[PDB]
Amino acid sequence: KEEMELTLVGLQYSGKTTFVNVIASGQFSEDMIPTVGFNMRKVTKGNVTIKIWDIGGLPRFRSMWERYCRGVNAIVYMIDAADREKIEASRNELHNLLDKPQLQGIPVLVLGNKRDLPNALDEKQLIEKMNLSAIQDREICCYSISCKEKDNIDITLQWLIQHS
Amino acid sequence: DPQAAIPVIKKKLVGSVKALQKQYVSLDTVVTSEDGDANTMCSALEAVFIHGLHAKHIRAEAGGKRKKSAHQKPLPQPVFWPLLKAVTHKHIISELEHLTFVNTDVGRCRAWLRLALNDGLMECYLKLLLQEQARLHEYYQPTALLRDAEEGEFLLSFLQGLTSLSFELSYKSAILNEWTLTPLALSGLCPLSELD
């Protein structure tokens, strides 16, 4: 059980590509261009190799999400924890995504990224504001992280590896 | 002070149900856990059960090997599972105790509440809980909302109104295994201050 695949989804600007780059290379960067379509990197961690599909989050790519989540070992749902304006759309897209029958039972890790920013929401506020308790068909968990300063990247990885 | 939270709880209860009644005036449609006012209602109903618990019923932890490296938000974890079991039929208890993803007594209490709402049984359960006053003494301080005779009459009347709605809340989510801030703040166990 030592190879696995993950898909990263969530709204534009939430930090999905940053997260992939930090996992693969440790590179954070403040300047980024929105991902067109999808991105992918393969990382090894211990005896686990992980293929990570990093899907664009802009509106015109969101129809891709269901397809790239089919058959994967786990789904990562990325949120900009400091962008309260986007919470409504992010929650709507999440529940819409997890309504698709082909994704039944796939574990989901919701990540409240950018915890380093002042008055970023924490994971328990996000649990409530994203109505995560509606999701009852799968393992589901919510962590506060920061790709910039590396908070909780360790346990994020350990939680995902548990599904290899 | 020991009852400062009671008006806050009552306003949220009433306000959230009125909100639900106005939104669900198509009236052929079920209230789910994707509705924020339904979750606010649940938080207020959880606050009813939390308010005035003896300190021994507030855990430092909810249970499970769920990693505490994150959750840099430490919250107290009230638990009252055997109080609920005492008034519940064995077939509901059995279903709740065998949930795949709900595995803490915190989760079982919160699942019980949402199941009771789906079944339309909240007034039924409260009548029993208020009839078993000796057992309530083992969970609640004398100043608790549930041990206040008048407020108990308010709550029964409020709960009767719930059968004007059809609930299909999620009662099986792993998210239920640990508390979040809103029910704890509404109950007074944490400061309303902390809400933002």
Ligand SMILES: Nc1nc2c(ncn2[C@@H]2O[C@H](COP(=O)(O)OP(=O)(O)OP(=O)(O)O)[C@@H](O)[C@H]2O)c(=O)[nH]1
């Ligand atoms: N302060 C702070 N900024 C971050 C953090 N993580 C990512 N960012 C910034 O957020 C912006 C968007 O990052 P991206 O990784 O491009 O976001 P995305 O989710 O991949 O966006 P799409 O490709 O359009 O879906 C960039 O400027 C990053 O530098 C973080 O942990 N803290």
Ligand SMILES: [Mg+2]
């Ligand atoms: Mg990107």
